[PDB]
Design a protein around this ligand. Structure first.
Ligand SMILES: CC(=O)Nc1cc(-c2[nH]c3c(c2-c2ccc(F)nc2)C(=O)NCC3)ccn1
Length: 303
């Protein structure tokens, strides 16, 4: 037929891993696609991610383009597949390690990330309605960079969907599910009210603020830039525990350092102010993704 299906895809190269599942580059009718493969015992993880990607009206330029969920039986065992668009640059983490960006490049990455998150967060009311969705594991490793230098959000397996008429969530969430380094203060200290969907949106904004800091460090002006680092590289070990993160983020109340050279550029001043306003301990005080999108759109227009 015309639809993309697993039996018509040939795996070519191992390209990493997801939270669950192993990622490959494959070919479908001459075109490159990305394939995330799960085992039969990981069906719940694969199914939940397939479910989120199939949400009505989810598609957006800054959300990874989902192609299919399928099974492939090789004659011995069955693999569970998720197929998506393939992006040669890979993650924002990979891109920022390999390259420095211009002021224009930085705004393009930050604006596209905020636009993808605002689309995920936004409820679309109508006949073909879209529920609001919170990611719960946003980080530079699961944001991908397209050939045009814009981002798209990926790895939606941990997402939660809201039913606005009842103020209920489609799953019963576990505590502290995501990447420890990017956990919001209220997630680290377990004070987050998980009965309020808005708490999850607010936790995603804190993580997006950390990602903006990673991008801004790589913004080169007159050959001046910082080296690549993960947020809190100066305060916690690699692979930090919840306790290590909590002591820094909740108790000492530290955030990634904003360098002095970011006050000398309008674009870096705007970005630094956005970061601070994503990093309050209280989620209710943070900026929304839609407000950040408006601010960077005004900045992109001017620059
Ligand atoms: C060069 C290069 O890696 N390209 C590339 C990688 C991915 C990819 N990277 C990650 C994930 C996925 C991915 C793949 C298929 C799919 F269905 N959902 C997601 C993922 O799940 N988790 C984080 C890391 C997607 C597209 N292009």
């Amino acid at each position: 037929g015309h639809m993309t299906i697993a039996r018509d895809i040939v795996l070519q190269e191992s390209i990493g891993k997801g939270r669950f599942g192993e990622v490959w580059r494959g070919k479908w009718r001459g075109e490159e696609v990305a394939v995330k493969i799960f085992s039969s015992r990981e069906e719940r993880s694969w199914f939940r991610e397939a479910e989120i990607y199939q949400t009505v009206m989810l598609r957006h330029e800054n959300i990874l383009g989902f192609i299919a969920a399928d099974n492939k039986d090789n004659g011995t065992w069955t693999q569970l597949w998720l197929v998506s668009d393939y992006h040669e640059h890979g993650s924002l983490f990979d891109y920022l390690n390999r390259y420095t960006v211009t002021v224009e490049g930085m705004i393009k990455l930050a604006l596209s990330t905020a636009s993808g998150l605002a689309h995920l967060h936004m409820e679309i009311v109508g006949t073909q309605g879209k529920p609001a969705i919170a990611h719960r594991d946003l980080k530079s490793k699961n944001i991908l960079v397209k050939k045009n230098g814009t981002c798209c959000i990926a790895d939606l397996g941990l997402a939660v969907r809201h039913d606005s008429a009842t103020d209920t969530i489609d799953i019963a969430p576990n505590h502290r599910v995501g990447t420890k380094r990017y956990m919001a203060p209220e997630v680290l200290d377990d004070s987050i009210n998980m009965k309020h969907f808005e708490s999850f949106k607010r936790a995603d904004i804190y993580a997006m603020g950390l990602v903006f800091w990673e991008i801004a460090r790589r913004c080169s002006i007159g050959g001046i830039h910082e080296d690549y680092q993960l947020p809190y590289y100066d305060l916690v070990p690699s692979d930090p525990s919840v306790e290590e993160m909590r002591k820094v983020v909740c108790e000492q109340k530290l955030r990634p350092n904003i360098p002095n050279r970011w006050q000398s550029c309008e674009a870096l001043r705007v970005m630094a102010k956005i970061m601070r306003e994503c990093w309050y301990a209280n989620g209710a005080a943070r900026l929304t993704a839609l407000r950040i999108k408006k601010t960077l759109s005004q900045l992109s227009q001017q620059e």
